[PDB]
């Protein structure tokens, strides 16, 4: 296990914005999270809730692709994207699954069905962000330089979007193929405050349910407070069981009558 | 036109055999040839069909996963590979050419036929 | 291929051309189910289905829904509620072979009538009388398929016609490029925006993967065009009281 120091931002939209500070109400991965330190050297079947943030740190190409999915077998759709050469790969056909995909071995797909879409075409961190809404499928990458011995650096930099998909596919399962680091994290609807510099680079952000000073900070849009008092949210408290008191009598409705009734 | 059949002998269950049989005479109207089956205690049955000038072929439900047909144009040849052989298939095949008359009639000529047994 | 082994080819996620389609050549039959000619090119659909086959002149007529016939019947089915297209031409010089072109077979007979969008592949032989037959055709049992008497003398009701049936968002055609203007407060309509303005250019740098520029109180002030990747500015044209 590891946490998150303030790493998984990226750009939401395709919007220019210069020295401004914005607020953003879509799904992220909340700051100092809890994550899974997977290690193969394995590869186990994880669920799909919303989106998965992904990484690695490998001196060789031991990642290869993932194998996507909802019921994942040889009997319905699928997503397969794989790279055993200078090229991608991308099908929804797939429906050729098996106990141990571990693969010039290439003994994944043992049989094919109606296929799609065809966009074959052309240590470090290696961070990405999968998310399938409105019937569209979008990843997020980038890299960067790194050096580290356990589980990840400080500072931040955002991600920008790669590719865009209409698959369609309800994906309600997610694997992983390799030939070191491979880390899992989740996704959750939250609030952000992310700022601007001229040239249009995210360069800081805050969260606004971490600490009460975040709150502060993300209610009068600003990084520094003066002193004062201030008025942020309200307090309630919420109900913990449930009574469904009724009557006590019992005897079925005389409906014969009226509605399987011989002459009206 | 003549239909000389060649190949098919006494093979094992599970193993493979391919039969081929050559049409030699009038060129035929119609490019279609077929394979037959008649089972010692039953009658004729169909394995393949093969047209070539629509490329498709056409296998009955019983042995559509198995049984496999080919052809060779240039010369005149057609095959037919049997694979995952059981004993159900026990039988003398046969070979059909089908050509047609003036007014469109399909005909059809019966080869000779060679016995194919699966035997342990 | 004949009519009894129809091929089916489908077309998605590419730009279609509808009008030039009939502009390409000349077509004896050309009606549409459900879809109009004119808006051909207005329209943006999820599925195409080209459908082929080659009939007689007097078997065209049956390609169509509520249809009956041998073709109708035994080689292809078109549903009631079809929305689509049919095209038909005569193909008596490159699909005619000449004196009775015995390669186009179709069907007479089956045991039960076609469903719409299906393909009859099977060649057992039919029985037709009480008389069984165990793979051998003779009396009142007949194969499935005939030859087509296609020949160059025959008639225009017998001559061959190749026919294209399309069956219908990832297939639409766009249209309708324009130059640029300058210095002169125009009426404009990029790629989902609408707005007037004047258009100059810029000093601004942006990034390889956007498009927009939003100032505070979200106001455009900045596009990119989309064919020299050229940035831009927008101001209104001037307004004030009198
Ligand atoms: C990025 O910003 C720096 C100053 O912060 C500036 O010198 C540089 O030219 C900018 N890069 C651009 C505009 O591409």
Redesign the pocket.
């Given at each position: 296990y590891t946490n998150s120091f303030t790493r998984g931002v990226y750009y939401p939209d395709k919007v220019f914005r210069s020295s401004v500070l914005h607020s953003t109400q879509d799904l992220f991965l909340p700051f100092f999270s809890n994550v899974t330190w997977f290690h193969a050297i394995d590869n186990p079947v994880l669920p799909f809730n919303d989106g998965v943030y992904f990484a690695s740190t490998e001196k060789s190409n031991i990642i290869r692709g993932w194998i996507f999915g909802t019921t994942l077998d040889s009997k319905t759709q699928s997503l397969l994207i794989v790279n055993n050469a200078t090229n991608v790969v991308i099908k929804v056909c797939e429906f050729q699954f098996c106990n141990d995909p571990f693969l010039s071995e290439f003994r994944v797909y043992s049989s094919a069905n109606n296929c799609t879409f065809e966009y074959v075409s052309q240590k470090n961190l290696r961070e990405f962000v999968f998310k399938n809404i409105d019937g569209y499928f979008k990843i997020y990458s980038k890299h960067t330089p790194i050096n580290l011995v356990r589980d990840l650096p400080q500072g931040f930099s955002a991600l920008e979007p790669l590719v865009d998909l209409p698959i369609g596919i309800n994906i309600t399962r997610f694997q992983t193929l390799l030939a070191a680091a491979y880390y899992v994290g989740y996704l959750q609807p939250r609030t952000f405050l992310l700022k601007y510099?001229?040239?249009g680079t995210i360069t800081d952000a805050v969260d606004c349910a971490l600490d009460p000073l975040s709150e502060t900070k993300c209610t009068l849009k600003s990084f520094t407070v003066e002193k004062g008092i201030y008025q942020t949210s309200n307090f309630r408290v919420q109900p913990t069981e449930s009574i469904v008191r009724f009557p006590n009598i019992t005897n079925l409705c005389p409906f014969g009558e009226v509605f399987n009734a011989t002459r009206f | 036109v003549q239909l000389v059949e060649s190949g098919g002998g006494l093979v094992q269950p599970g193993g493979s055999l391919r039969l081929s049989c050559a049409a030699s005479g009038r060129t035929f109207r119609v490019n279609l040839m077929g394979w037959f089956r008649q089972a010692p205690g039953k009658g004729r049955e169909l394995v393949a069909s093969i047209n070539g000038f629509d490329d498709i072929t056409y296998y009955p439900d019983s042995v559509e996963g198995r049984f496999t047909i080919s052809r060779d144009n240039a010369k005149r040849m057609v095959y037919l590979q049997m694979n995952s052989l059981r004993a159900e298939d026990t039988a003398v095949y046969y070979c059909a050419a089908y050509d047609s008359d003036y007014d469109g009639r399909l005909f059809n000529y019966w080869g000779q036929g060679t016995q194919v047994t699966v035997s342990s | 291929a004949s009519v009894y082994a129809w091929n089916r080819k489908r077309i998605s996620n590419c730009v279609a051309d509808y009008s030039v389609l009939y502009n390409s050549a000349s077509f004896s039959t050309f009606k549409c189910y459900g879809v109009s000619p004119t808006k051909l090119n207005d329209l943006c659909f999820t599925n195409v289905y080209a459908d082929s086959f080659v009939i007689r002149g007097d078997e065209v007529r049956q390609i169509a829904p509520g249809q009956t016939g041998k073709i109708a019947d035994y080689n292809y089915k078109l549903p009631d509620d079809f929305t689509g297209c049919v095209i038909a031409w005569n193909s008596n010089n490159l699909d005619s072979k000449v004196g009775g072109n015995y390669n186009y077979l179709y069907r007479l007979f089956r045991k039960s009538n076609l469903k719409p969008f299906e393909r009859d592949i099977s060649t057992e032989i039919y029985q037709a009388g009480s008389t069984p037959c165990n793979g051998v055709e003779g009396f009142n049992c007949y194969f499935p398929l005939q030859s087509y008497g296609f020949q160059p003398t025959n008639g225009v009701g017998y001559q061959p016609y190749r026919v294209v049936v399309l069956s219908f968002a990832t297939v639409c055609g766009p249209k309708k490029s324009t130059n640029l203007v300058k210095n002169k407060c125009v009426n404009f309509n990029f790629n989902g925006l609408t707005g007037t303005g004047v258009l100059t250019e810029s000093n601004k740098?942006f990034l390889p993967f956007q498009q927009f520029g939003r100032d505070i109180a979200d106001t455009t002030d900045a596009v990119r065009d989309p064919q020299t990747l050229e940035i831009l500015d927008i101001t209104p044209c001037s307004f004030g009281g009198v």
């Open positions: 510099n001229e040239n | - | 740098k």
